[PDB]
Curated annotation (Swiss-Prot):
PROSITE patterns: LIPASE_GDXG_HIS. Keywords: Hydrolase, Serine esterase. It comes from Actinidia eriantha. Its EC number is 3.1.1.1. GO terms for molecular function: carboxylesterase activity. This is Carboxylesterase 1. It is an enzyme of class 3 (hydrolase). It catalyses: a carboxylic ester + H2O = an alcohol + a carboxylate + H(+). It comes from the Eukaryota.
Length: 307
């Protein structure tokens, strides 16, 4: 198991995180070397949640405002942070190569805070952005052009945040959401799918490791057909349709979660939502976080989508 998640299971239903996940300090000052300026802002001290802003260096050498991306990291709901190096680095590259201001949310983790905790923090992050008078937000970010995005579990979160935000859209103004970006959103269910069975001995996401994730994440008692797990009523798509939101879903064939990711893109389309789907052959789960080349190909498509 330390072979697939950097955690210990203890005989009282809790976990221990014995392996440091490397993180990167914010770098808010423009005399720093960095092509991207970062700073952390306290969100809710009771939840110990915070937001990391990424401001691309090129925003400073003009006076136009960039689309604002609200980003949620991946990690099975149970690990990582807005400041973890791999998500920090991905978000710096996205700011530069997609031309975006990024608000990356450090949401509460499971099992200590089982779902719906992190959807709750997502909504506070939106209510808090709307209300914000932060200088980087106010001088450099286009509130009219906002996208909700997440990788993996963060794509799960981004999707539920998106549904909830659709309901209260009038309440967010000056914030105007134009779309959702779901990067291999993390999804499940009680019956195995074709990819789940085909890929069952995956070398990153095997069957047991994902069973484990949903066990730690889902409310106590729940099965994998819980609505937070398995998205596919959908009266909710009518509201998303009506507001004119585009949804990008992306994944690859070498991800066990593929059939559910693709199945959700089908359901969104089938219901009249403007869906930009991008499903590749091969690769594996989170290849974009390791492969600078595959990330770059994705920024070309996201840059497109964002304008």
């Amino acid at each position: 198991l330390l072979k697939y998640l950097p955690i210990v299971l203890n005989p009282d239903r809790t976990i221990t995180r014995p392996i440091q996940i490397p993180s990167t300090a914010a770098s808010p000052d423009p005399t720093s070397s960095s092509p991207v300026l970062t700073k952390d802002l306290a969100l809710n001290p009771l939840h110990n949640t915070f937001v990391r802003l990424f401001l691309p260096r090129h925003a400073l050498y003009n006076s136009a405002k960039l689309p604002l991306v609200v980003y949620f990291h991946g990690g099975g709901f149970i690990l990582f942070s807005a400041a973890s190096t791999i998500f920090h680095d991905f978000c710096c590259e996205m700011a530069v190569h997609a031309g975006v201001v990024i608000a990356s949310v450090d949401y509460r983790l499971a099992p200590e805070h089982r779902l719906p905790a992190a959807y709750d923090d997502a909504m506070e992050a939106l209510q808090w952005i709307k209300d914000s008078r932060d200088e980087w937000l106010t001088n450099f970010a286009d509130f009219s052009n906002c996208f909700i995005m997440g990788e993996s579990a963060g794509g799960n979160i981004a999707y539920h945040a998106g549904l909830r935000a659709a309901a209260v859209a009038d309440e967010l103004l000056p914030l105007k959401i134009k779309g959702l970006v779901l990067d291999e959103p993390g999804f499940g269910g009680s019956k195995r799918t074709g990819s789940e069975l085909r890929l069952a001995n995956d070398s990153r996401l095997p069957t047991f490791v994902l069973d484990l994730i949903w066990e730690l994440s889902l409310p106590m008692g729940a099965d994998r057909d819980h609505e937070y797990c398995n998205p596919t009523p959908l009266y909710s798509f009518d509201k998303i349709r009506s507001l004119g939101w585009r949804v990008m879903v992306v994944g690859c064939h070498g991800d066990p979660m593929i059939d559910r990711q693709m199945e959700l893109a089908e359901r969104l389309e089938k219901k009249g939502v403007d869906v930009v789907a991008q499903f590749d052959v091969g690769g594996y789960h989170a290849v974009k976080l390791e492969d600078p080349e595959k990330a770059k190909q994705f920024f070309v498509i996201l840059k497109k989508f964002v304008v």
